[PDB]
């Protein structure tokens, strides 16, 4: 179970690192108010 | 499935293969391999782009993944599965006795020796998610 839980945790925390929001879980890099690149502020991620 | 019944697809050939690769899961592709026979790797090597130069650039790897050239997979038939791809290190388990028990019998046929050799081997798929196939039906 410990080998199987340590797997599911590495796979549940990897989902939060991308699309997880702020509530009780890591905020993924996708939920960070993306703004068009060129109009790039600091509190946001640029995109093309 | 590829498309046309006999060969690969008529228009987007080699796309039934490139999605066969990316239909297998990120973790089994780390160490996976195609499996074909000699006559199918030739039928793959002859695939060529709109110009004539074949579009696939000692393991005889394909698309970066190794290829095990078996000699027992079915040819490219109407609905055959000529190309398999998967992590057989996790997808297929072989159980066996790693020796060869040779019992020479100079007794039954008396002026002869009549070697009786026999190995015990078995195996089925262990992980149905670790082996993906290629049907040529539609």
């Amino acid at each position: 179970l410990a080998n199987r839980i340590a797997d599911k945790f590495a796979r549940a925390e990897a989902a939060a690192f991308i699309s997880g929001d702020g509530v009780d879980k890591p905020t993924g890099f996708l939920t960070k108010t993306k703004v068009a690149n060129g109009a790039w502020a600091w509190g946001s991620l640029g995109y093309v | 499935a590829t498309g046309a019944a006999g060969d690969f697809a008529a228009v987007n050939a080699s796309d039934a293969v490139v999605d066969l690769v990316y239909a297998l899961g990120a973790e089994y592709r780390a160490n996976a391999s195609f499996v074909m026979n000699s006559k199918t790797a030739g039928a793959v090597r002859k695939m060529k782009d709109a110009d004539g130069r074949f579009l696939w650039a000692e393991p005889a790897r394909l698309m970066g993944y190794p290829v095990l050239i078996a000699e027992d997979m079915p040819d490219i038939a109407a609905n055959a599965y000529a190309i398999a791809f998967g992590d057989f290190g996790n997808g297929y388990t072989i159980a066996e006795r790693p020796d060869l028990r040779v019992l020479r019998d100079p007794f039954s046929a008396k002026p002869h020796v009549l070697f009786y050799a026999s190995k015990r081997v078995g195996g089925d798929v262990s992980d149905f998610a670790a082996i993906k196939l290629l049907k040529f039906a539609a």
Binding site: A12 | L68, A70, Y92, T93, A95, P111, K119
Partner: protein, 96 residues
């Protein structure tokens, strides 16, 4: 004079070199001295919660298990080599 020649023979009796690509070099080989191998897989996965501070956790699902039976059949050949050959045939027929 041509009787004094004695053509030299090979060292080892060679043979047609047929394909050894066997899927055994990539598959999972397990040595078992029994009548069957029972491999155990986990066809499902667990569950996780992202608990709170006051969540009062409940049960999380537990992986369900599948058993596959490898019947471990056998493979036998019985070539009948003559006894007059085995001793008159400076090659090693037993190990060939």
């Amino acid at each position: 004079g041509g009787y004094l020649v004695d053509p030299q023979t090979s060292e080892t009796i060679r043979g047609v070199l047929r394909s050894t690509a066997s899927l055994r070099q990539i598959a999972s080989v397990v040595n078992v001295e029994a009548t069957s191998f029972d491999v155990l897989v986990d066809k499902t996965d667990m569950g996780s919660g992202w608990a709170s501070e006051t969540a009062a956790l409940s049960e999380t699902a537990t992986p369900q298990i599948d058993r596959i039976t490898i019947p471990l059949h056998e493979l036998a050949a019985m070539p009948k080599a003559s006894q007059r050959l085995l001793d008159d045939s400076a090659f090693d027929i037993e190990t060939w």
